[PDB]
Write an enzyme that holds these catalytic residues in place. Structure first.
Site: not given
Ligand SMILES: O=C(O)C(=O)NNc1ccc(Cl)cc1Cl
Ligand SMILES: [Mg+2]
Ligand SMILES: [Mg+2]
Length: 714
Positions: A124, A126, A301, A328, A421, A446, A448-449, A530, A620
């Site tokens: 859904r 996607a 749909r 990815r 990242e 990236g 967060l990583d 998002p 994520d």
């Molecule tokens: O920052 C990172 O390491 C990263 O690769 N992706 N961050 C991210 C990816 C998908 C969603 Cl749904 C939400 C986030 Cl925060």
């Molecule tokens: Mg990442």
């Protein structure tokens, strides 16, 4: 056993059948040749994959030792940088060069705009992401806090006209700002017509055209009473829908019903950190959605068709109705038992993804059920996450080369979106881009990583700053600038995307609209959102900021030094009070528990998860990498005790239980903690955090999800 034997490989039947019956037909690839190719590629590249992972371990050990033999802490950057060079962490930077990647679509080479990332396991979401190329601005404004819910303008069960008027006024200002009239304001417009290929806007006292007539791209309906007017600004389309017979049109001074924005220009269908997939059955669910997307027949749909327009002079044309898709893949670390060898050892999952997602992507290069759905220029777009340094990039390129041969594809069909990242990629970025100079279609921070890797790499140095402090540390600001600098120096402008990270606060759209403008201002031609709603709102930023101009002005600037990149985010002495320590512990334990319970119990790898302050975050798996590493770091250095951690997990568990009155499938963690596999997973991620390779959470999460699955069967 139910597995299929192909050379040294033993393939799960569910995967063998999916590939033979669904993925292969229509590609003209001989099935026996494909499977022999899989066996040969896995056999040939597995040892180098393993050598690269061991090399990560050896470097980290040497860095761990470096910190432990030191006791100074004024920290000698000259010695540290020298050390990193001696051990081969910091590699020489190569001479200037320009990337040569070709056969890339306009959405990537030229167009600046939002990039949406969604879990490929959710059909859904996607579908909605693929369709998010076009989105309603009125819906995004009315439905979010961008229009404040003040007195009188609140959302209710039904349409509030006062709020709607604020929506209309906001959008009129956007038009004035983006596609200005020669004189007057769209706010006073009374009608639209097309005369001699020119847009004419009627005002109360007169009529006027566009200050820049070139921004008139087309229309629908009769020129003398159009049903819509299409405009273009900074390469992105804006459509004004006209319908006085609509509930909003009826009240509007020009009968305008909506403003539609071209929004999610590209979309990344994610097999990695936003999904939970631990076995053959999970991988097949993902592959099958990716297949449906590429064939155009996924129905949860359905996928949108292209949009028809009349050109200004009166001829006909079309525009894509869908977001251009990347996939990815997972990175170099994990294995998956979808295929094992004769010894029972699992095959590397990154190798499998290249083979299978690449096979499947061939369908998106061919006619659907209408036109072909994906790349008209003939490329397959793969995002490769979590690489450490230029040898790992080269390995990815060699893997793609070998897959192209198995698949009968021309060399360099398989393009690479490089995640920046991991620290060892950051400090060797130019060399990483060089290793992929004929394949690279983006670099993306990236963050967060990258934060997770920053903490693990310097784990032994000392206690780190708090999680919320990390986004403003010198290392990360330098990291972001350095990424842009490297891309532009490698000639990305007009050739490849320079991308930035995700906005995670899904309900804080006013804040998003206020602050995320910083990314295109920093010269990023794309950034992650998002949701389709967030894509529509982030699109506004690209109308306000001329990314092409910003990038040209940045040309040849070097705004980050190696020393700045290497500035470890160590907390200063006596940084926090006892209440602040507990606040941070609670924050991280709640973040870990909230994410992990959905992952382990329900196989959901991304969703709107309320944080400790009940702010909804969509993150994520990388958020888990940060929180688990930060707590491991504080435990390592005596900031907190193991009782502090236990007590916090205990306190936060029922709060997460309550937050998940979200419904039917949820099992509470409290009060039987040691009976909750998810609770034990969270605990294990913290207490074994320091010992996980590069702080990666997958080995523990995958084990615990498989354990959960196995119990749910019996
Ligand atoms: O920052 C990172 O390491 C990263 O690769 N992706 N961050 C991210 C990816 C998908 C969603 Cl749904 C939400 C986030 Cl925060
Ligand atoms: Mg990442
Ligand atoms: Mg402009």
């Amino acid at each position: 056993t139910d597995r299929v034997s192909v050379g040294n490989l033993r393939i799960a039947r569910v995967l063998y059948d999916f590939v033979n019956n669904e993925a292969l037909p229509g590609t003209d690839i001989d099935p026996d040749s494909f499977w022999a190719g899989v066996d040969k590629v896995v056999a040939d590249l597995t040892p180098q994959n393993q050598a690269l992972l061991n090399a990560r371990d050896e470097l980290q050990a040497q860095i761990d030792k470096w910190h432990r033999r030191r006791v100074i802490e004024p920290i000698d950057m000259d010695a540290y940088r020298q050390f990193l060079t001696e051990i081969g962490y910091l590699l020489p930077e190569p001479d200037d060069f320009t990337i040569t990647t070709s056969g890339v679509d306009a959405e990537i080479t030229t167009t600046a705009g939002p990039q949406l990332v969604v879990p490929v396991l959710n059909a859904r979401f996607a579908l909605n992401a693929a369709n998010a190329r076009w989105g309603s601005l009125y819906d995004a404004l009315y439905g979010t806090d961008v229009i404040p819910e003040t007195d009188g303008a609140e959302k209710g069960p039904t349409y509030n006209k006062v709020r709607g008027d604020k929506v209309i006024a906001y959008a009129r200002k956007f038009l004035d700002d983006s596609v200005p009239l020669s004189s007057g304001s769209f706010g006073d417009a009374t009608g639209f017509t097309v005369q001699d290929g020119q847009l004419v806007v009627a005002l109360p006292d007169k009529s006027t055209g566009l200050a820049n007539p070139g921004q008139f791209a087309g229309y629908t309906g009769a020129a003398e009473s159009p049903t819509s007017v299409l405009l273009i600004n900074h390469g992105l389309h804006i459509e004004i829908l006209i319908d006085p017979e609509s509930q909003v049109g009826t009240t509007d001074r020009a009968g305008v019903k909506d403003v539609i924005l071209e929004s999610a220009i590209t979309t990344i269908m994610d097999f990695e950190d936003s999904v939970a997939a631990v076995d053959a059955a999970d991988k097949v669910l993902g592959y099958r959605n990716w297949l449906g997307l590429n064939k155009g027949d996924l129905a949860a749909r359905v996928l949108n068709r292209d949009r028809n327009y009349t050109a200004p002079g009166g001829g006909q044309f079309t525009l894509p109705g869908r977001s251009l898709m990347f996939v990815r893949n997972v990175g170099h670390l994990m294995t998956n038992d979808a295929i094992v060898d004769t010894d029972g050892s699992e095959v590397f999952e990154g190798i499998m993804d290249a083979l299978f997602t690449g096979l499947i992507a061939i369908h998106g290069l061919k006619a659907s059920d209408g036109p072909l759905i994906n790349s008209r220029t003939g490329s397959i777009y793969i995002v490769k996450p979590k690489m450490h340094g230029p040898a790992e990039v080269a390995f990815t390129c060699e893997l793609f080369s070998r897959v192209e041969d198995v698949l009968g594809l021309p060399q360099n069909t398989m393009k690479i979106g490089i995640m920046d990242e991991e620290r060892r990629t950051t400090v060797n970025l130019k060399a990483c881009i060089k290793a992929a100079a004929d394949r690279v279609v983006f670099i993306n921070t990236g963050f967060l990583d990258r934060t997770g890797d920053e903490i693990h790499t310097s784990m032994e140095a000392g206690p780190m700053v708090r999680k919320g402090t990390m986004k403003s540390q010198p290392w990360i600001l330098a990291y972001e600038d350095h990424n842009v600098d490297a891309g532009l120096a490698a000639g990305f402008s007009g050739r490849a995307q320079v991308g930035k990270g995700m906005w995670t606060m899904t309900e804080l759209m006013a804040d998003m609209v206020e602050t995320k403008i910083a990314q295109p201002r920093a010269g990023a031609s794309t950034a992650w959102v998002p949701s389709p709603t967030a894509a529509t709102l982030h699109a506004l930023h690209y109308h306000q900021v001329d990314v092409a101009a910003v990038q040209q002005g940045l040309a040849g600037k070097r705004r980050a030094t190696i020393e700045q990149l290497l500035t470890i985010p160590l907390a200063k002495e006596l940084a926090w009070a006892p209440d602040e320590i507990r606040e941070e512990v609670d924050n991280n334990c709640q973040s870990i528990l909230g994410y992990v319970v959905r992952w382990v119990d329900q196989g959901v790898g991304a969703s709107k998860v309320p944080d400790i302050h009940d702010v909804a975050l969509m993150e994520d798996r990388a958020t888990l990498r940060i929180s688990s590493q930060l707590l491991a770091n504080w435990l390592r250095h005596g900031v907190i005790t193991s009782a502090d951690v236990r007590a916090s997990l205990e306190r936060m568990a029922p709060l997460v239980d309550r937050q998940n009155a979200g419904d039917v499938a949820y099992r509470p963690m409290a009060p039987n903690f040691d009976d909750s596999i998810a609770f034990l997973a969270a605990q294990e991620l913290i207490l074994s955090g320091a010992q996980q390779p590069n702080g990666y959470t997958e080995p523990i999460l995958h084990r615990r999800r498989r354990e959960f699955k196995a119990r749910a069967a019996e």
